[PDB]
Amino acid sequence: MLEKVVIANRGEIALRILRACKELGIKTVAVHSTADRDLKHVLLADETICIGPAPSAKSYLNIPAIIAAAEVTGADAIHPGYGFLSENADFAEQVERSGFTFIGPTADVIRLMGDKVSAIKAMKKAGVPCVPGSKEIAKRIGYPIIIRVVRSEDALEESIAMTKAVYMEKYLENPRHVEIQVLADTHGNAVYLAERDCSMQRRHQKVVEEAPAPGITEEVRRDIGSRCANACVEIGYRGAGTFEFLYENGEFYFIEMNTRIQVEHPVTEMITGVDLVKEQLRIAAGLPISFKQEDIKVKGHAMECRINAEDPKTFLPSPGKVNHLHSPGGLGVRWDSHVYGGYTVPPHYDSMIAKLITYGDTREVAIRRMQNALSETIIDGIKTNIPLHELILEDENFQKGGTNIHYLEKKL
Amino acid sequence: MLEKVVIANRGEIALRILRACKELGIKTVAVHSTADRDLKHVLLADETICIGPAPSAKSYLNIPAIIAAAEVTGADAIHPGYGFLSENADFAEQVERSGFTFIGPTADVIRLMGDKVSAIKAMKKAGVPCVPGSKEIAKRIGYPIIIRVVRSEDALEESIAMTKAVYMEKYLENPRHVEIQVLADTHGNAVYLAERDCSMQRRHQKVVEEAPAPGITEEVRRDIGSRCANACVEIGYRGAGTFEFLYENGEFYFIEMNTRIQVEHPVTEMITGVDLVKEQLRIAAGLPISFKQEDIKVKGHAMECRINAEDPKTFLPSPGKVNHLHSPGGLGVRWDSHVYGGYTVPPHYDSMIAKLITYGDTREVAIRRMQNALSETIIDGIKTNIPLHELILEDENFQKGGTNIHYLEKKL
């Protein structure tokens, strides 16, 4: 089985992975850049290997250095986390060709779902609902469409010329972002783990996520979920994955499959009692999913706020030394973070410093727990987006639930 | 209903209570000594009132000052936490006589269960199983007994003389400490919330607690639990309470009812999904328990380590400035603590600085999560008992489960 895993990532997800490994008695190898020697997970890992200088291109995206790290430590597997190389099929193929287990899908399936086109075709074949699309095509679909968004037909031709200098589909004006978590194993099983609503976004970048999605009934959950699970089997999916949908007037429209773990996986953990990273590790080792579809029942409600080191108004990054950290706790409060007092947040990577996750028996309780946890949270020395979260949580439309993917931008 | 609550306590439980109040939209009044101005909950509270100098006798046990705090702020209720005045019936009676709601049982019921004697009599009347006891009495009971422990009969007389300078009962040589959580409301309802095993003790002081208790079947849980619930109704109990038992060769023997919330309440929260402090507040306001007995089902397993500022070998207190705190997190990790980086732990009160609580789908998972969380925990500037917890968790007998109340002392 898996005895030693290279954690080919950094920051909070690297720590998340290390925690799962340590629970399973799996030895860890932390590969890191020169700028990341003081990362919490690096300090906790069984072995450490510096894979390059600060820039991602020369370290966390350095395929030969990461593979060499696996070789010299005698590792069995590599966990890519999210971002960086996690959906790089050339990386996955090289990992397997080098004799290591890639903790994720097979390269071929990554490539398949890594092409906007083949993805849709595979989903349509599998019965997963997609956005209508593909001269009179635009007409068939119904305006507005998108090649440049086109709202009228007299502008279609010119628009197509602009963009070409190459396909269409229905533009949904005000949809929600709703995504279905799945797991698939090497024993022919695939399960769905309810859904997440991640509609609160700025520039297509998620800010707050929750589970389950407000308004979604169990009947609807079972319908869309079962289609996603079937799809997994049809394409030979392996590991954790997410089917992302635009959701509008009660209809789902596939937009992308993330063939990896996602940042917001913890809200699903809280409402289903599944440890998604441990399942990744078990599935990669060849084991079956540790439960059946009938074992899963949504209970309660969970929310996640991505706490970023950035100015809460202009959103410019705020690197620097965290002089004081006070993290919240108590019942129904979860804190997933690599940051500690005295830690210096570097400029080289993303701005995430923590994920604050709350759970309650109702959405109302989860929201109030999030507000109270935020009020207890102190991060001194750098700016954070905590004030933005506090604005979102007290928003009357957010309290009602069901705000669309353009709402946050409209607000502000 | 309850609009403003005086938190008549300090440290972690005061913070726990404040969090529950804030969730329910209840205004908080933090009464504190001069030594406790920098307590986290004090800094978070809506109103603060200094009730006296550092010594407990002059502050947290100062009944007139605490009641005056309720009066001048126009509070509705007082939550006594645990320790201090929480089981002081004279305090409860004065609180009610002064027109405030005491968040706990009525004074009469406190006094009843506050007398080793009347307690037993009430339990025996109610069908709760008690320790056999009360010339030939000792004979009936069976040695060893206790007046000074007596192991033989030729020493009974002399022993009785020693102690008198006044009753007997069976001495259980190697029992476990198993306790049943209850709630009772003003609508005639009473429920049991499974049990906790708190056998890991030093000098009768709990160190690690867990829930449920290993070896205890649901059938046994329902039997002892239902007797405890009935007892609540019979004595007119109100609020949260615990029936503590010695447990040996599959039999329960009542020793005490804690008529208050207990330190270790969080492990029960994790396995039942009940917020015990919120229920205290709701019950005090006159509401029914928010669920029925059939709604409760034990799921998973939870553990708690009391992290104390003390030398892990000699157990002498270790007051002083916490120069660095790094608290653990992630899935199934709960941290209940008022301590923050830069906080100075005072000498005047108990040594508790945090309760680290883990939860998992099995006892094995909860234990491993506790070990990993402890390894991530950094408390620099003072000594803690973390090394003791690490010794306990890796103990093969503890791993097996079911160690008795003298085990820790035998170990060491």
Curated annotation (Swiss-Prot), chains A, B:
Coiled coil: none annotated. Residues 1-412 form the Biotin carboxylation domain. Its EC number is 6.3.4.14. It comes from Haemophilus influenzae (strain ATCC 51907 / DSM 11121 / KW20 / Rd). This is Biotin carboxylase. SMART domains: Biotin_carb_C. It is an enzyme of class 6 (ligase). Hydrogencarbonate binds at residues 206, 260, 263, 306. Pathway: Lipid metabolism; malonyl-CoA biosynthesis; malonyl-CoA from acetyl-CoA: step 1/1. Mg(2+) 2 binds at residues 256, 258. Mn(2+) 1 binds at residues 244, 256. Keywords: ATP-binding, Biotin, Fatty acid biosynthesis, Fatty acid metabolism, Ligase, Lipid biosynthesis, Lipid metabolism, Magnesium, Manganese, Metal-binding, Nucleotide-binding. Residues 120-285 form the ATP-grasp domain. SUPFAM superfamilies: Glutathione synthetase ATP-binding domain-like, PreATP-grasp domain, Rudiment single hybrid motif. It catalyses: N(6)-biotinyl-L-lysyl-[protein] + hydrogencarbonate + ATP = N(6)-carboxybiotinyl-L-lysyl-[protein] + ADP + phosphate + H(+). Biotin binds at residue 306. Its cofactor is Mg(2+); Mn(2+). The active site is at residue 260. Binds 2 magnesium or manganese ions per subunit. Mg(2+) 1 binds at residues 244, 256. Acetyl-CoA carboxylase is a heterohexamer of biotin carboxyl carrier protein, biotin carboxylase and the two subunits of carboxyl transferase in a 2:2 complex. Mn(2+) 2 binds at residues 256, 258. GO terms for molecular function: acetyl-CoA carboxylase activity; ATP binding; biotin carboxylase activity; metal ion binding.
